[PDB]
């Protein structure tokens, strides 16, 4: 299916406060889609940003396995503890205000946990002709972004998701 929900029973409000606090120490990079890597390659020199990527040439996710160490004392660490799968290349993926990206097919589905969002942030599946909202309800949403799609944020606030990759 396009999307499925899995209850993590995470507190959206404590999760937000934890993310907002982390970005004050480790700010998002890029524009349009702003990013922070939450997993890094073993023994990485640039653990907070190496995993961040948006150029046309996508590289493999398999090496970004280490949840950063300073997360285990934060509520954001609790999200990783509750995951029912082993995540790879986890990133904060924040859509800027009034921003959307190209209609395209992604390489791989991802799980999205919306941290901050609004009714103006949607996924748009072109062939399925469905519009999908991911609420900041503390639960995990599988989104099949291999389907022809775009995402937009028509609001004036950043739409912040945590986006988890998986092998299996």
Count of residues in contact with a copy of itself, rule CB under 8 A: 22
> How far apart (Å, rounded) are the C-alpha atoms in residues 43 and 148?
36
Confirm or reject binding of residue 155 to a copy of itself (CB under 8 A). Answer: yes
* 73 versus 119: smaller Cβ distance to a copy of itself: 119
Integer-rounded Cα Rg, in Å, for the chain is 15
Stretch of 5-13, 16-24, 81-89, 98-106 contacting a copy of itself, by CB under 8 A: 98-106
Q: Which long-range contacts (CB under 8 A, 24 or more apart) does 118-121 make?
A: 118/153, 118/155, 118/157, 118/159, 119/155, 120/152, 120/153, 120/154, 120/155, 120/159, 121/95, 121/151, 121/152, 121/153, 121/154, 121/155, 121/159
* 29 versus 131: smaller Cβ distance to a copy of itself: 131
Residue of 7, 81, 126, 146 that binds Fe ion (CB under 5 A): 81
> How far apart (Å, rounded) are the C-alpha atoms in residues 125 and 109?
13
CA distances from residue 2 to 5, 96, 97 in whole angstroms, order as listed = 11, 24, 25
Q: Which does 120 bind (CB under 5 to 8 A by kind): a copy of itself, Fe ion, none?
A: a copy of itself
* 22 versus 94: smaller Cβ distance to Fe ion: 22
Compute, in degrees rounded to 10, the torsion defined by CA atoms 114, 116, 18, 164.
20
Confirm or reject binding of residue 131 to a copy of itself (CB under 8 A). Answer: yes
* 68 versus 159: smaller Cβ distance to a copy of itself: 159
Q: Which does 30 bind (CB under 5 to 8 A by kind): Fe ion, a copy of itself, none?
A: none
Please report how close the Cβ of residue 5 comes to a copy of itself at its closest, in angstroms: 18
Confirm or reject binding of residue 78 to Fe ion (CB under 5 A). Answer: yes
Where do contacts with a copy of itself occur on this chain (CB under 8 A)?
Answer: 32, 98-103, 119-120, 122, 124-126, 129-131, 150, 152-156
């Amino acid at each position: 299916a396009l999307t499925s929900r899995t209850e993590l029973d995470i507190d959206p409000d404590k999760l937000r406060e934890s993310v907002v606090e982390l970005l004050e120490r480790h700010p998002l990079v890029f524009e349009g889609t702003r990013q922070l890597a939450l997993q890094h390659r073993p023994e990485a020199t640039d653990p907070w940003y190496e995993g961040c990527q948006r150029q046309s040439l996508i590289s493999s996710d398999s090496d970004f396995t280490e949840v950063h160490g300073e997360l285990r004392d934060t509520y954001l660490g609790e999200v990783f503890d509750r995951l029912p799968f082993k995540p790879i290349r986890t990133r904060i993926m924040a859509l800027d205000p009034k921003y959307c990206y190209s209609v395209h097919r992604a390489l791989t589905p991802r799980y999205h946990l919306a941290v901050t969002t609004s009714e103006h942030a949607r996924f748009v599946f072109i062939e399925h002709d469905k519009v999908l909202h991911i609420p900041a309800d503390g639960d995990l949403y599988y989104v099949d972004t291999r389907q022809l799609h775009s995402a937009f944020n028509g609001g004036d606030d950043m739409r912040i998701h945590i986006v988890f990759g998986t092998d299996g």
